[PDB]
Each structure stands twice: as structure tokens, then as C-alpha cells.
Design a protein around this ligand. Sequence first.
Ligand code: BCL
Ligand code: BCL
Ligand code: BCL
Ligand code: BCL
Ligand code: BPH
Ligand code: BPH
Ligand code: SPO
Ligand code: UQ2
Ligand code: LDA
Ligand code: LDA
Ligand code: LDA
Ligand code: FE
Lengths: 240, 302, 281
Amino acid sequence: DLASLAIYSFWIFLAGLIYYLQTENMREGYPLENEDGTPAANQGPFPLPKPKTFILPHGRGTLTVPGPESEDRPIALARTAVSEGFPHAPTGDPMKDGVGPASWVARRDLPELDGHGHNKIKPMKAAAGFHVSAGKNPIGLPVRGCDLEIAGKVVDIWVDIPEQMARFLEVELKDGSTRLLPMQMVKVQSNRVHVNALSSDLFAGIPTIKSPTEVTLLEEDKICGYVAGGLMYAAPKRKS
Amino acid sequence: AEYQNIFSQVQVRGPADLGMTEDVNLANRSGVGPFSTLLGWFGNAQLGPIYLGSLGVLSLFSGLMWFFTIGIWFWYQAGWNPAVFLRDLFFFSLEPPAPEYGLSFAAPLKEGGLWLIASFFMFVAVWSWWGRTYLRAQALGMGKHTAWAFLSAIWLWMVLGFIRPILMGSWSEAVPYGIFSHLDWTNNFSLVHGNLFYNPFHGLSIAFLYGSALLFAMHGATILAVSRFGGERELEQIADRGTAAERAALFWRWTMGFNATMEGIHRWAIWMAVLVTLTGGIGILLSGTVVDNWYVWGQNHG
Amino acid sequence: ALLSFERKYRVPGGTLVGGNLFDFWVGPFYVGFFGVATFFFAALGIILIAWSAVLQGTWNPQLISVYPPALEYGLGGAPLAKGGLWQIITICATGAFVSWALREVEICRKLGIGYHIPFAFAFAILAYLTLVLFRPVMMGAWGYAFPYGIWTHLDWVSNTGYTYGNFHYNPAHMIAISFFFTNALALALHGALVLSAANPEKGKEMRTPDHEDTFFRDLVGYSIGTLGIHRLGLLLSLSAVFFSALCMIITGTIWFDQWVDWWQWWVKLPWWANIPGGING
Ligand code: BCL
Ligand code: BCL
Ligand code: BCL
Ligand code: BCL
Ligand SMILES: CC[C@H]1c2cc3[nH]c4c(c3C)C(=O)[C@H](C(=O)OC)c4c3nc(cc4[nH]c(cc(n2)[C@@H]1C)c(C(C)=O)c4C)[C@@H](C)[C@@H]3CCC(=O)OC/C=C(\C)CCC[C@H](C)CCC[C@H](C)CCCC(C)C
Ligand SMILES: CC[C@H]1c2cc3[nH]c4c(c3C)C(=O)[C@H](C(=O)OC)c4c3nc(cc4[nH]c(cc(n2)[C@@H]1C)c(C(C)=O)c4C)[C@@H](C)[C@@H]3CCC(=O)OC/C=C(\C)CCC[C@H](C)CCC[C@H](C)CCCC(C)C
Ligand SMILES: COC(C)(C)C/C=C/C(C)=C/C=C/C(C)=C/C=C/C(C)=C/C=C\C=C(C)\C=C\C=C(/C)CC/C=C(\C)CCC=C(C)C
Ligand SMILES: COC1=C(OC)C(=O)C(C/C=C(\C)CCC=C(C)C)=C(C)C1=O
Ligand SMILES: CCCCCCCCCCCC[N+](C)(C)[O-]
Ligand SMILES: CCCCCCCCCCCC[N+](C)(C)[O-]
Ligand SMILES: CCCCCCCCCCCC[N+](C)(C)[O-]
Ligand SMILES: [Fe+3]
């Protein structure tokens, strides 16, 4: 009968859709690897899919996936155990090294462009004519680290222009240089910005950017990695 | 409970976003409407602009027509009394024609004719809007996924109000326009068909409805968790993967043994949702055209 | 075993309990203290459902069912074969679920992400706990909980429903359904928008988030934004479940009559309770 036929058909359709869904989702990260970076012996039942090509705008590159990949960076990690499945101890300082929770990715060393080919992110002081329009304005507040010491003061907000939201606080350090702080990791209070991830002596260590007026994708990832990284690695200085 | 990212600490504002042009006839765009500080804590502050358009106006005109046809009848049930209308608002009902008129358009206004009028308006209202989601897509040079997904919703609705009634051979099978009346119709439908818990498509549809809430809570929370790396910039993470797309997949992988990619997560999503009404529409279409009783059918698969 | 970029993330540290004792993977799966906790509670619970099957003398998945105590036992313990087994599996399930969340917290700690995922999961947990613990306790008997069978849980849904008439008239049930419906609408739209920008017309360049805001604004005169929509999805599905728990928490405790009859407070309001005509007068 037709009802019984429909339900059995649908199940077959469902096995096939999951099949497609699973393969679509293997366009990055595969084939799987041993802890040593070589193709793993057992890959599972799903094959890699046929390649596809994204063409980016403003002639910003084009991408085909899946395809061989490498980290494009060196990884200061070493084995702690004689078999599969254990952790890899940083061979250095994981903060500086870009490993663990402080990991970052070799993304393109250029700024994200908007639909009109302008830098998506800019300092407010250089984006006609953006302004804090509601809420507490952080520009001018002292920045306190998680050791309860002042690390510097907030001199600007870096804004996503097309989206119209605040992405970074630009912070002046006691030597006169600045670093970018993820907005998404600061607590704006009445009389300060409090930053839990970092202790005040880790700020000088934040990654710096090549130009006062734009941030690249790679620059972004390094800054974001380093700051999140402090949650675990600053932790000794907590301690309060 | 650190900085927990459901509401924004600081809002900013700049020159107004009139938006992408591509092949969009700019004469048809309203200006930007008001800014809401209230929205700005949660989403965007900017209201507007909207694209007017011919199809847009046909859609919006016909839509109101529908809403008004139903409303005009409710005032007639309220005896033209404002207090009665307000008291019995959810009890009013624009019911289809009686079984005997079958599939014909010759029902009296007070006897299923107004329902057919209102349905006609509803029908052009939806389909004209569907063509919209395609066109606004086309003007910007975009994929057709929205019109595609929308079609799955339109499928359930068509089956309920149009396709099944025609296959039963009468408009009395269709759904009345009323708040509570539409709920009673629903319950009755199940009762009069052996209980929809025995319809395999009802339980598939539930699985997907539940699964869409499972999936959206997973996606929503995941993105908020990695937004300290700008993970909510999903198109840029597709073209040039960052550590947010990486920690995201590694969470799921270490948790449950597999993971998605920024692009493929959005493929799971569309299907999770479109399957709801897809399986549901088939469920309802078979009911009474092919199976009077799902329990009985259940008890043999035959 | 590893994704091509996984290794730099598998460092020591994170765990809530036990220092480095349980800090390792198995295949792709992170273990942790709560991984071991999860396994212990889940095997126990499965062994006992296996025992339940043996005692009722079947192996058919469509007929194994684990029933709570009979009502006359109230909130007390019950002999194993008369709902004690149900009580112990319920403890197992809970410990399994809370452990799963807690393991997720260790994974968060390790990766340096926010705790949003497990927090969102706790909402599902509390829905379950409402049906098997908060509602039975407030009703005064374990027997009001649902049975653990693939088909028998549906009977339970259905009887609970029709005890109060058409359950559709639960106000909280209605707010709940609006959310599941809206959550799905949003899921489909989010999906469609991202993909349609990622996958433009033949031979065009990948669209940008500006095209995305634009299409949606062109369509409905608003756009919530990239951060916005992920907050929205989360809100819609959590609110969906919160109102579910709420609609069941009030049922049979503060309201145990026909739901349809609750609506009479509006109809019977003194200013119009008596005007002839319309539906109710
Ligand atoms: C799937 C099985 C049943 C069904 C099952 C039920 C059940 C059960 C419930 C609903 C509920 C809803 N149903 Mg129904 N109902 C269905 C058919 C539909 C159809 C349709 C096919 O056109 C429509 C328009 C409605 C719409 C309505 C809404 C009033 C309500 C919330 C839906 C929602 O949040 O969606 C998505 C949200 C949106 C953003 C758009 C929707 C906005 C609303 C306002 C538009 C609908 C009609 C509108 C004219 C409302 C009038 C307002 C008053 C004059 C004040 N139903 C089919 C026939 N529906 C719930 C309810 O609370 O009912 C009282 C509920 O418990
Ligand atoms: C939620 C409100 C009601 C509910 C009423 C409904 C109704 C109505 C229906 C279901 C149906 C489902 N319910 Mg129920 N059911 C509830 C209680 C739950 C609970 C629980 C609280 O622990 C569980 C595990 C289940 C699970 C089940 C599944 C068998 C089925 C598909 C769900 C789904 O795709 O979800 C979405 C989640 C996913 C897509 C992820 C996968 C989850 C599933 C596949 C895992 C569960 C497997 C199951 C055999 C668990 C046994 C434990 C074993 C050790 C594995 N229900 C409460 C009491 N449920 C439908 C059905 O067809 O059943 C016959 C159906 O029509
Ligand atoms: C007593 C009642 C019966 C019941 C009988 C029904 C019936 C009848 C149906 C369902 C169906 C549904 N049932 Mg049931 N079912 C019951 C038990 C339940 C239970 C439970 C016990 O917990 C659950 C979880 C479900 C849930 C499910 C859903 C999967 C499904 C709703 C699909 C949907 O998203 O439509 C919501 C969306 C739509 C209806 C599409 C609407 C799309 C567009 C076209 C509307 C546009 C409107 C616009 C013009 C106006 C808006 C104004 C705006 C402001 C602009 N049922 C019991 C057994 N159920 C449906 C189904 O498919 O089942 C197979 C269905 O027909
Ligand atoms: C005849 C039946 C009645 C009625 C009976 C009632 C009853 C009774 C209930 C509902 C409730 C539900 N009803 Mg109703 N309702 C009906 C009509 C409908 C209709 C419709 C189309 O008319 C709809 C859409 C709904 C839908 C709603 C939802 C709001 C709600 C279910 C979701 C939920 O609570 O999740 C909650 C989520 C969970 C409990 C799942 C959590 C599971 C997690 C913690 C763990 C699972 C892990 C494990 C098992 C997985 C296995 C491991 C594997 C390896 C994967 N009802 C009809 C009128 N309704 C229920 C509710 O509000 O629930 C509290 C409820 O009890
Ligand atoms: C995958 C299944 C889910 C789904 C999919 C889905 N729905 C969708 C979409 C898709 C992806 C569409 O793109 C389309 C959309 O544009 O969304 C923004 C839509 C849509 N689904 C909608 C609602 C809806 N979908 C349904 C649900 C679902 N949709 C499922 C859960 C339901 C439920 C669950 O009950 C509802 C009620 C609309 C938001 C929209 C369809 C728009 C439409 O057809 O409109 C036609 C009629 C009008 C143009 C106006 C209607 C008349 C009004 C009563 C008055 C006008 C109000 C207006 C807003 C103000 C104007 C005032 C002026 C006069 C000044
Ligand atoms: C809060 C919004 C929605 C939501 C959220 C949510 N669910 C989630 C997550 C979150 C974000 C988790 O991170 C977690 C996950 O890891 O997902 C991949 C999860 C999860 N929700 C799941 C399923 C699920 N979610 C549900 C739905 C919901 N989850 C809500 C709709 C439902 C529904 C709607 O029916 C189900 C079936 C799992 C896939 C996963 C949790 C898996 C897990 O906790 O694993 C550890 C525990 C075991 C391995 C089981 C232990 C064995 C028990 C002792 C025996 C089981 C007894 C049980 C009571 C039997 C009942 C039988 C039924 C027939 C009734
Ligand atoms: C204050 O007063 C005024 C008048 C100003 C405004 C008040 C308005 C009010 C109070 C009215 C509110 C409207 C209500 C309560 C509507 C509720 C809607 C509901 C619950 C409907 C839900 C289901 C709808 C379905 C499933 C019907 C689908 C219909 C179709 C598929 C159309 C099929 C087309 C037909 C029959 C016509 C065929 C003809 C051609 C040529 C195509
Ligand atoms: C594709 O993503 C989507 C957005 O586009 C970027 C949205 O904007 C919205 C709609 C936003 C809402 C609910 C705001 C409501 C506020 C009022 C009262 C006007 C939905 C559903 C959507 O899914
Ligand atoms: C689905 C969400 C509904 C949002 C409605 C937005 C209204 C459109 C505003 C455009 C009008 C602009 N204005 C005021 C200059 O005319
Ligand atoms: C996007 C894929 C989601 C897969 C969900 C599969 C869940 C199985 C649901 C069982 C329903 C059983 N029934 C009644 C149809 O026989
Ligand atoms: C809702 C339907 C979900 C289907 C769940 C099973 C899909 C997991 C398969 C992926 C296996 C992981 N692997 C081996 C590729 O790494
Ligand atoms: Fe997304």
C-alpha cells in the first residue's frame, strides 16, 4: 500500500541525506592524522567529498576544499606519554608559542573587507561618525588586570562598521604603546575596565598590530588566542 | 558568571546603512526607520529600510484583505458590538463550506462562501510573498536557499488548506480561521483518524521539531562560546578558517566523537528545520486519502 | 584519530576533579573525571534496564518498558520489580546527564571557550527533572512520572493530556508551542541566509554579511545581526523548554481541572459577562 511505500522510501532518503551531510562536513580537518601529523590508518566509513571552490570578493583569494593542509606555523608541543591519547606539554611558554587555549591560526595577513571593499574594522576616532550611543562609555577608564593592578587606560573603541558593534578596546600601556583587547573579554564597570583573562604584567605581552588604523585577520587570531590563553596560564596569578 | 554575552555592554552608532545595491532597483527602498536602544542590547538597533515593490504591494494588499475578511465576519458574529467582539475574540470562527457543497464555489457568504473568498486572498498573499524571497535573493546575486526552505513550510500549509481537501473532495475538510477553532480542528483531526501517534510521519516530524530546538541551542551556544574569537563571523570563517571555527569543532568532537564545519553546520540546520513540515505534510496528505486509521494501519503495515 | 589542526589544542589542564589522573582522549573522545563518572552511571543504568527486561521476560525494544511505582506507594521506596528499578535508573540517568554537562565544562576549560553550551544543556536536564522529580514530588507520588519505554511514554503523554481535556488549552503549553514553531522558522532562515551568501549564483563571488543584512532587510525591513541571530536561536529554544517545564509544573499542582475551563475568567469579567449575542452570550 501507498503509506507503507512512502515510509520505507523516506528512510532510504534519510540514510542518503545523512551520508551527504556527513561528507559535506569533512571539507576541513580531513584526512585524519596520527599524533605525528601523518595520515592515520583508520579513516572511518565516509569518503572525502569532491572539491568545491569559493571565490572571494575584491580579488581577495579563492578557496578549494577539501585539499591538503598544513598548520603553516611551527608547534612547540611534545609528547608526555609512550602511547596514543595523552596530552602534549608545551616545550616553551604556551602564551608566546601560540599553543593550547592560546592557539591562533595562520589566517590571511590582510583585513576583512566589507561589501563595499572598505576595512570592516576601524578605530572609532577614525570612522566618520561613529559614537557610543548607549551604555557606559569605556573611553578614558583605567584597565585593571586580574591581579587587581592597573595595566593601562582605554583610549579608543575599534568598531565593526557594517554590523555597527564594538569589537576591541584600544588600551594605552605605561610605555605609551597600545594593544587591542577583545570586547568580548572585558568587563566595563562604572570606574574601570576589568579584564579577567590577564594579569597586568601580561599586557605588554599582547601581540601588536602593524598599522594604527587596521587589523588583519591573522593579527586578530593572535590577539584573541593570547588573551583567551590567560584564562588557564595566568591562573597562578589568582592567587587572590 | 564573568562577561557572559547575552546583552551588549556598549552600543555604538554610525551613518546609516542603506545596504548593498547589486541589481536592486533602489527607487523601491524606503529610508531607514527609527533606531531602538532596546533592541541594541540584544541585536541591531537599526530599523529599515524595506524594499516596497510591485509583488510586495500585491502580497501585502492581499494579506490584509484576508486578515480583514476574517475580521469582518467576527464583527458580524459579535453582533456589531465592541464589547462582545473583545470578549469572544478567540471563540469566533470562519468555518469552511458544509460537506454537501463539495468542492464547489457556490456556497452562500454566510455558509462557506466568505471562507473561500478569504482563502483566495490568503493564497495569493503567500505565493506572491514566496516569489519575493526568490527575487530579493536574485537581485543580490544570492543562492535560492530561502525560497527553497520556505517552500517546505508552504507544502504543509497547502496540504492542510488545499490539496487534501481537494483529494477528500470537499472544502469541509479544510481548517477554519479561528484561534480556538483551529485548535479543536487539530485535536479532532487526530481523533477522527485513529490517533496521530500511530502515523510514522507524525513522529518523524516530532523528532525534527525537537531536533531543531536541540540543534539551534547547540549552534547558538557554540557560536556565543567562541565569539571571543569572532566566531559569529561565519562567512569569513568559511573562506578563511580561524581558531574560533577550530575550538568549536573540537568541542563537539571531544564531546560526542564527530563535528561539523562552519559551512556544513548551516547545512544540518536547513535540513533539520525543513524536514519538520516535509514529513509532516506527507503525514497529513496520506491521512484519509490513503489511511482512515493510523492505529489500524499500524497494526498490519498494509 | 586527530583532525589536521587538533594537536596544538590537546595540552594538559582543565579538569575539575583529579588533576591529571583522567586527563586523556580515547579516539576522538575526551575522557576526564566526569567522562569516567558518565560511563559508571550509564553502564549501571543500562545493566538495570537489561535486568528489567529479563524480569518482564522480553528483549523486543518496542516492548521493554520501565514503570514507576504504583500511586499507593507515594514518595516512598518500592520493591525492585514494582518500581524500585525505575527509581534507581532515574538516579542513574540524572547522574549520567549532570556528569555529561560537567565533562563539557572540562572541555570548555581545556579549549578556552565560554560555558554557553553546558548551560544550555542544563535547561534540557531540568525539563526531564520536572517530569520525573519536581512534578511527582509536588503531586505526592512517584507514580505520576513517565514510564521508560519507546511506546509506553507516548501513552503516558496522551493520558496526561486528556486528563485535563484538550491540553491545547494550557496557556503555558501555547506559549511553549509558539517558541518551538518560531525556533524552527529561525533555524531555517539562519541556515538559508548563510548558505545562500556562501553559495551564490553560478560563477558569482561569495556574498558578504552585508548582502545578508541587506537581503533580510529588503525582505522584512529588519536584520538582527550575526551576534544577534545566534543569541536569538539560543533564546528561542531555551524559552521553548522553560515554558514546557512551566506548563507541566503547574499541571496537577496549582491547576488540576479541565484546562478549557480556565478561560472562563475572561468571558465572565463583570463588564461584559452579560451582553447577549456573539458566541458566549
Ligand atoms: C500544526 C498543527 C496545526 C496548528 C497547531 C496549533 C497549536 C496546537 C498551537 C498553535 C498555535 C499557533 N497557531 Mg496554529 N496550527 C496550525 C495552523 C496554523 C497556521 C497556518 C497553517 O496558517 C497559522 C497561521 C497558525 C497560527 C497560530 C498562532 C496564533 C499560534 C502561534 C504560531 C507561531 O508562533 O508561529 C510562528 C511565529 C511567527 C513569527 C508568526 C505568527 C504570528 C501570529 C500572530 C500569526 C497567526 C495568526 C494571527 C492572525 C494571530 C491573531 C492575533 C489576535 C487578533 C490578537 N496556525 C496547524 C493546522 N497552532 C499555538 C497557539 O498559541 O495558539 C493559540 C498553539 O498552542
Ligand atoms: C518531550 C515531551 C515528552 C516526549 C513525548 C514525545 C513524543 C510525542 C514523541 C516522542 C518521540 C521521541 N521520544 Mg519522547 N517524550 C519525552 C521523553 C523523552 C525522553 C527523556 C525525557 O529522556 C527521551 C529520551 C525520549 C526519546 C524519544 C525518542 C524515542 C523519540 C525521538 C526523539 C527525538 O528525535 O528527539 C530529538 C533529538 C535528537 C534528534 C537526537 C537523538 C535522540 C534520540 C534518537 C536518542 C534516544 C534513543 C532512545 C532509544 C533512548 C533510550 C536510551 C538508550 C540507552 C540508548 N523522549 C517527554 C515525556 N517523544 C517521538 C517518537 O516517535 O517516539 C515513538 C514522538 O512522536
Ligand atoms: C490532540 C492533537 C494531536 C496532534 C495532531 C496534530 C495535527 C493535525 C498536526 C500535527 C502536526 C504537528 N504535530 Mg501533532 N498532535 C498531537 C501530538 C503532538 C505533540 C505532543 C503530544 O507533544 C507534539 C510535539 C506534536 C507536534 C507536531 C509537530 C511536529 C507538527 C507541527 C508542524 C509545524 O511546525 O507546523 C507549524 C507550521 C505550519 C502549520 C506551516 C505554516 C506556514 C505558513 C504558510 C503560514 C503563514 C501564515 C501567514 C500568512 C500569516 C501570519 C501573519 C504574520 C504576522 C505575517 N504533536 C496530538 C496527537 N499534530 C502537523 C503535522 O504535520 O503532523 C503530521 C499537523 O497537521
Ligand atoms: C494528547 C497529547 C496532548 C499534549 C500532551 C502534553 C503533555 C503531557 C506534555 C506535553 C509537552 C509538550 N507538548 Mg503537548 N500536547 C498535545 C499537543 C501538542 C502539540 C500539537 C501539534 O498539538 C504540540 C506541538 C505540542 C508540544 C508540546 C511541547 C511544548 C512539549 C514537548 C517538548 C518538551 O517539553 O521538551 C522537554 C525536553 C525533554 C524532557 C527531553 C530531555 C532529554 C535529555 C535531558 C536527555 C536525553 C539523553 C538520552 C536518553 C539520549 C540517549 C543517548 C544516545 C546515545 C543519543 N503538544 C496534545 C493535545 N504535551 C510536554 C512538556 O511540557 O514537557 C515538560 C509534556 O509532558
Ligand atoms: C521550516 C518550517 C518552519 C517555517 C519555514 C519558513 N517560514 C517562513 C520562511 C520559511 C523559511 C519564509 O522565508 C517566510 C519569511 O519571509 O520569513 C521571514 C516565512 C513566513 N512564515 C511566516 C509565519 C509562519 N510560518 C510558520 C512556521 C514555519 N515556517 C515552520 C516552523 C507558522 C507557524 C508555525 O504557525 C507561521 C505563522 C511569515 C513570518 C512568513 C510568510 C510571509 C507571508 O506569506 O505573508 C503573506 C501575508 C502578508 C504579506 C501580510 C499578512 C497580513 C497580516 C495579518 C497583516 C500585515 C502585517 C504587517 C507585518 C504590517 C503591515 C502594516 C502596514 C499596513 C502599514
Ligand atoms: C534545551 C533545548 C533542547 C536541548 C538542548 C541540548 N541537548 C543536548 C545538548 C544541549 C545543548 C548537549 O550539549 C547534549 C549533547 O552532547 O548534545 C550533542 C544534549 C543531548 N540531548 C540529547 C537528546 C535529546 N535532547 C532533547 C531535547 C533538548 N535538548 C531540548 C529540546 C531530547 C528531546 C527533545 O526528546 C532528546 C531525546 C542527547 C543527544 C545529548 C545528551 C546525551 C547524554 O546526556 O549522554 C550521557 C547520558 C547517556 C549516554 C545515557 C545514560 C543511560 C541512562 C541511565 C538510561 C536512559 C534512561 C532514559 C530515561 C530512558 C527513556 C527512554 C525513552 C524512550 C523515553
Ligand atoms: C479590529 O477589527 C478589524 C476588522 C479592523 C481587524 C480585526 C481582525 C481580526 C480579529 C481577525 C483575525 C484573524 C484570525 C483569528 C485568523 C487566524 C488564523 C488561523 C488560525 C488559520 C490557520 C490555518 C490556515 C490554513 C491551514 C489554511 C490554508 C488555506 C489555503 C491553502 C488556501 C487554499 C485556497 C482556496 C480554498 C481557494 C481556491 C481558489 C483559487 C483560484 C486558488
Ligand atoms: C536570518 O536571520 C534572521 C534575522 O535576520 C538577520 C532576523 O532579523 C530575524 C527576525 C528578528 C526578530 C525576531 C526581531 C523582533 C523585534 C521587533 C519587535 C521588530 C529572523 C527571524 C531571522 O532568522
Ligand atoms: C518581522 C519584523 C518586523 C519589523 C518591521 C520593520 C518596519 C519597516 C520600517 C520601514 C519604514 C521606514 N520609515 C519610517 C522611514 O518609513
Ligand atoms: C537531520 C537528521 C536527524 C535524524 C533523526 C532520527 C530520529 C529517529 C526518530 C524515530 C521515529 C520513529 N517512527 C515513529 C518514525 O517510527
Ligand atoms: C541526527 C543524525 C546524526 C547522525 C549521527 C552519526 C553521524 C556521525 C558519523 C561521523 C563519524 C566521525 N568520523 C569517523 C568521521 O570521524
Ligand atoms: Fe550560524
